[PDB]
Amino acid sequence: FNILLATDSYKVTHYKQYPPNTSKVYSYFECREKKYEETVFYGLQYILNKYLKGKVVTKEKIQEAKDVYKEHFQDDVFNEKGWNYILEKYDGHLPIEIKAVPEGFVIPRGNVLFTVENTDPECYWLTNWIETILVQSWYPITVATNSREQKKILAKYLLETSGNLDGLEYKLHDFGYRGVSSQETAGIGASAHLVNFKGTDTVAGLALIKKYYGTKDPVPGYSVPAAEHSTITAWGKDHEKDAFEHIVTQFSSVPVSVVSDSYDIYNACEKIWGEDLRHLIVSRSTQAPLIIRPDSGNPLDTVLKVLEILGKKFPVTENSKGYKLLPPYLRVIQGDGVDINTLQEIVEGMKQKMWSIENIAFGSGGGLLQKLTRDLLNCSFKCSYVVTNGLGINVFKDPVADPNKRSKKGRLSLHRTPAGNFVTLEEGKGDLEEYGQDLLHTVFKNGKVTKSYSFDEIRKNAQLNI
Amino acid sequence: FNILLATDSYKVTHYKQYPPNTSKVYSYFECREKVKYEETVFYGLQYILNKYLKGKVVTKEKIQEAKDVYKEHFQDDVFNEKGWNYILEKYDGHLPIEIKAVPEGFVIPRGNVLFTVENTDPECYWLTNWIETILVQSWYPITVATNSREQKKILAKYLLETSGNLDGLEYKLHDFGYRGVSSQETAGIGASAHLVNFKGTDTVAGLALIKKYYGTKDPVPGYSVPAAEHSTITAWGKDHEKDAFEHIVTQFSSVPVSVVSDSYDIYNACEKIWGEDLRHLIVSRSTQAPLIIRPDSGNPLDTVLKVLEILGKKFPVTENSKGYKLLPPYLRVIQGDGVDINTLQEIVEGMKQKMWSIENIAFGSGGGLLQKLTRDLLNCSFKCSYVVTNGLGINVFKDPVADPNKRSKKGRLSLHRTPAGNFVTLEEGKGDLEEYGQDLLHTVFKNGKVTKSYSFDEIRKNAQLNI
Numbered sequence: 001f002n003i004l005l006a007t008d009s010y011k012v013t014h015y016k017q018y019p020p021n022t023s024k025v026y027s028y029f030e031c032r033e034k035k036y037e038e039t040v041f042y043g044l045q046y047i048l049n050k051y052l053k054g055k056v057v058t059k060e061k062i063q064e065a066k067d068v069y070k071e072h073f074q075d076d077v078f079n080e081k082g083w084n085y086i087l088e089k090y091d092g093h094l095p096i097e098i099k100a101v102p103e104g105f106v107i108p109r110g111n112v113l114f115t116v117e118n119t120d121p122e123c124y125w126l127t128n129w130i131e132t133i134l135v136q137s138w139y140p141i142t143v144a145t146n147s148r149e150q151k152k153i154l155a156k157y158l159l160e161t162s163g164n165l166d167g168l169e170y171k172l173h174d175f176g177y178r179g180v181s182s183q184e185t186a187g188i189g190a191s192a193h194l195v196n197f198k199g200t201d202t203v204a205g206l207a208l209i210k211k212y213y214g215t216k217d218p219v220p221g222y223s224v225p226a227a228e229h230s231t232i233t234a235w236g237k238d239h240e241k242d243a244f245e246h247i248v249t250q251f252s253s254v255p256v257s258v259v260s261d262s263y264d265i266y267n268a269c270e271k272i273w274g275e276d277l278r279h280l281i282v283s284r285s286t287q288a289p290l291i292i293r294p295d296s297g298n299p300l301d302t303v304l305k306v307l308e309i310l311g312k313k314f315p316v317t318e319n320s321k322g323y324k325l326l327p328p329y330l331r332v333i334q335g336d337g338v339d340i341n342t343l344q345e346i347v348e349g350m351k352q353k354m355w356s357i358e359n360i361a362f363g364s365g366g367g368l369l370q371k372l373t374r375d376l377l378n379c380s381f382k383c384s385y386v387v388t389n390g391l392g393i394n395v396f397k398d399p400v401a402d403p404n405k406r407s408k409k410g411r412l413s414l415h416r417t418p419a420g421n422f423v424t425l426e427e428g429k430g431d432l433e434e435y436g437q438d439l440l441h442t443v444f445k446n447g448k449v450t451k452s453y454s455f456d457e458i459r460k461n462a463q464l465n466i
Numbered sequence: 467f468n469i470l471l472a473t474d475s476y477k478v479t480h481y482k483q484y485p486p487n488t489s490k491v492y493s494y495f496e497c498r499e500k501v502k503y504e505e506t507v508f509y510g511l512q513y514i515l516n517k518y519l520k521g522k523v524v525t526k527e528k529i530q531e532a533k534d535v536y537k538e539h540f541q542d543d544v545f546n547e548k549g550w551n552y553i554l555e556k557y558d559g560h561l562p563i564e565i566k567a568v569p570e571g572f573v574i575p576r577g578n579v580l581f582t583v584e585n586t587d588p589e590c591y592w593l594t595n596w597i598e599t600i601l602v603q604s605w606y607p608i609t610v611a612t613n614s615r616e617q618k619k620i621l622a623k624y625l626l627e628t629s630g631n632l633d634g635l636e637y638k639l640h641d642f643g644y645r646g647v648s649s650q651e652t653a654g655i656g657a658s659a660h661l662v663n664f665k666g667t668d669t670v671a672g673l674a675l676i677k678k679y680y681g682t683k684d685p686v687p688g689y690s691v692p693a694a695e696h697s698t699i700t701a702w703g704k705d706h707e708k709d710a711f712e713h714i715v716t717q718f719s720s721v722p723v724s725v726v727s728d729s730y731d732i733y734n735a736c737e738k739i740w741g742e743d744l745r746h747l748i749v750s751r752s753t754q755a756p757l758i759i760r761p762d763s764g765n766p767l768d769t770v771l772k773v774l775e776i777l778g779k780k781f782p783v784t785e786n787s788k789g790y791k792l793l794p795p796y797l798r799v800i801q802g803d804g805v806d807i808n809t810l811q812e813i814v815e816g817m818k819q820k821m822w823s824i825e826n827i828a829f830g831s832g833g834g835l836l837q838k839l840t841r842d843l844l845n846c847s848f849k850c851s852y853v854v855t856n857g858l859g860i861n862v863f864k865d866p867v868a869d870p871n872k873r874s875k876k877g878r879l880s881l882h883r884t885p886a887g888n889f890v891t892l893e894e895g896k897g898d899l900e901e902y903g904q905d906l907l908h909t910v911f912k913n914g915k916v917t918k919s920y921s922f923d924e925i926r927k928n929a930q931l932n933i
């Protein structure tokens with residue numbers, strides 16, 4: 001990896017654009033105000049450790065960057081002097097300072113989450129050089145926030161229909177590994193989902209957490225054995241019962257997810273599970289149920305049709321909250337077309353049809369880790385303050401056509417209010433310590449990670465009220 | 467990186483689920499039938515083969531780590547330590563797998579076999595669908611290359627209708643999506659994918675990917691221009707927008723420069739600062755060094771039309787051979803906000819309706835180009851189609867009653883080009899008859915080694931538009 005080649009091209013030319021005699025460039029990250037009232041701050045420690053800490057500048061990196069950018073711009077615009085400065089004076093270590101809200105902290109929109117400044121006036125251009133690599137934290141932030149929002153829906157509906165929050169941390173399972181853009185995205189996204197839930201099929205996320213965060217538990221996330229269409233359809237169109245029988249017998253002591261929509265989901269629930277192999281199901285443990293998996297059709301209408309069939313072939317109880325509960329050796333998983341909107345649609349339809357949320361689990365692939373953008377939480381990195389000719393000025397943008405794009409002014413700090421809420425203090429006002437100390441702790445300074453958090457601490461901060 | 471830890475967790479347990487005495491598992495990848503994305507660009511496999519699948523990908527170390535993790539992950543011992551040990555012993559960690567794919571860059575209609583995977587060792591029947599997760603991640607460069615190519619079709623048609631030539635087409639859609647992607651690796655894969663169709667990028671990560679994985683005759687596959695950002699305008703102070711503008715155009719007077727003009731008032735900046743106050747610094751610039759005014763807010767088409775009507779009333783507007791309004795050669799525009807395949811269509815059309823040539827404008831796209839894409843867009847699917855159990859080869863498939871669109875193909879597959887130039891995917895091993903000529907799929911991977919590679923220039927030629 002080469003940090004000198006890990007920015008937007010045009011940032012190569014910015015050192016020549018700042019006001020002459022600019023000694024400081026101070027920039028901040030925030031989730032700009034536009035549903036998602038509060039964001040989970042997660043993922044920066046990964047970026048600091050993997051990409052910014054230690055000797056990140058070398059003579060070969062400088063040369064390679066210079067050789068690439070000479071052809072890339074068809075002009076020598078690369079600041080070789082500026083980069084050799086960092087190498088000589090600092091031994092390749094970035095003279096930068098990043099103050100940030102503790103990871104896992106739940107902060108409402110329009111608040112400073114982290115700040116960047118150069119610790120050496122010759123590196124005034126370095127602050128916004130590393131914007132690109134830092135802005136990419138929109139991803140773990142958005143995944144963790146969106147995952148926590150679904151956990152709130154799942155908490156509301158499970159508690160309403162059952163009376164408790166038993167098994168909430170397993171109600172949303174990650175199926176996203178294939179539906180993400182890369183192996184790195186898989187690890188980052190999966191880890192961000194694991195801030196709120198304990199179930200994932202994206203193995204990549206476990207190694208990231210082990211490496212960059214750590215948990216007291218040997219693993220941060222768990223899974224169950226499961227079928228796929230290949231394991232079902234490999235038996236032949238005539239032998240779907242055989243497949244179903246084989247699989248449930250091979251995983252008879254553990255919970256097993258069996259995809260039941262390969263030919264006819266309705267017939268598999270009515271004839272194969274409900275009659276032909278009913279004897280194999282009603283014998284299962286509460287600790288090792290059969291999790292029936294539909295995977296096609298309208299997600300809500302399929303879940304209700306599947307519950308109806310099962311409710312007719314298996315004994316259903318009425319729980320303390322007056323809702324229908326399947327036998328404990330039988331559960332359902334919706335893993336198709338699940339995003340925050342369809343999940344909410346399904347749990348509402350279920351409550352309307354007097355079905356408990358104890359009966360269902362949800363699997364989400366693309367909707368959980370892919371169908372997300374930087375615009376969702378309005379993740380913005382902006383220069384709020386500069387020091388030119390020794391004088392500090394408040395910097396900001398205010399486009400005429402978009403008042404949502406009106407960034408903060410001056411040096412910023414985040415403080416806890418006397419009522420336990422959060423407040424972003426602009427223009428150095430925080431130095432007065434009216435609402436106490438600033439919550440933005442120094443995490444990085446001159447090539448060193450100064451403050452780290454374990455995944456156990458992150459999970460603790462991201463907790464719901466309920 | 468550990469391939470044993472680079473799969474969907476449930477796949478660890480599938481070796482116990484296939485029919486007993488199964489010697490072969492054969493699977494294929496397609497972009498299932500249903501902006502209508504009628505054809506797809508095949509790109510990105512060679513990257514995956516080289517980065518993650520070739521060579522010794524199994525060690526005693528890799529086996530113990532996977533065994534340890536999964537014991538805890540599953541709270542049971544399901545891991546096929548036996549199966550993985552067999553690859554380490556017999557094949558020196560090389561995967562006894564065979565991948566056949568259509569040449570990269572090839573533009574194939576939807577619902578056609580793009581690639582196939584099968585085991586070369588009967589004992590590794592389970593390995594075919596183990597590597598499914600890593601291979602289906604090919605959806606991403608396939609999808610970025612297709613949607614980028616679809617924007618090129620729009621750009622080609624409008625540049626041809628407004629100017630009568632495609633001069634500058636490969637620079638009309640620039641990649642501004644480096645910060646809007648989910649990771650560094652994605653940035654590189656995504657950028658490279660757009661570079662299959664265009665030569666304009668700011669996502670530097672993709673140059674290194676092309677160089678390392680594909681290669682070009684040209685020293686770099688992508689290019690950029692010096693450009694301002696909000697921090698380099700706003701750092702001068704709210705009252706010194708003019709001073710910021712002046713200093714940037716003076717520092718870059720010999721090269722083209724993109725200047726972000728919306729920091730406070732895009733229209734005032736075009737009318738007063740660019741139009742009056744600094745006009746003398748613009749009208750003086752070279753044809754090879756224009757000022758590219760960048761609006762970056764408000765309604766993308768409305769803003770472009772208003773900014774063009776302002777620049778036309780402050781600078782000398784000529785007329786091209788097709789009768790379309792053309793700004794003077796030292797002045798151009800870049801729309802780099804809210805640009806996706808939909809808004810780009812509206813803008814080129816909106817400008818065409820106002821008799822503005824498309825030579826005037828360039829487009830910039832971030833999230834629209836690199837992130838706001840899902841595996842669902844092209845219905846990228848990997849499915850088992852053929853199995854050999856107890857010596858008998860059987861055509862396997864899925865056909866969900868409530869989704870005929872999820873119906874997979876049967877048996878051994880082959881892709882052919884028909885005499886009329888069309889494309890057919892022959893199911894059930896029918897391609898063995900030599901009716902439609904040679905199968906378009908080639909062995910790209912066999913037993914831990916890359917058997918066929920493509921250069922980035924070959925891909926670029928294959929992905930070229932008809933126009």
Ligand SMILES: O=C(NCc1cccnc1)Nc1ccc(CNC(=O)c2ccc(CN3CCNCC3)cc2)cc1
Binds near residue numbers: 173225332361
């Ligand atoms: O579908 C699955 N993979 C396919 C896939 C994978 C990847 C990509 N694409 C498709 N995997 C699966 C995973 C988790 C879940 C949720 N878990 C349950 O439903 C459940 C319920 C009750 C109990 C018993 N107990 C425990 C002790 N406490 C009381 C309850 C145990 C588990 C369901 C399915």
Ligand SMILES: O=C(NCc1cccnc1)Nc1ccc(CNC(=O)c2ccc(CN3CCNCC3)cc2)cc1
Binds near residue numbers: 009641799
């Ligand atoms: O906006 C930009 N960065 C901001 C950013 C960056 C990253 C993230 N977010 C915002 N960069 C920018 C890049 C390319 C382009 C397209 N290029 C042109 O407009 C152009 C026009 C004419 C000529 C001269 N010609 C004469 C004949 N011979 C060939 C050259 C050369 C180039 C525009 C802008």
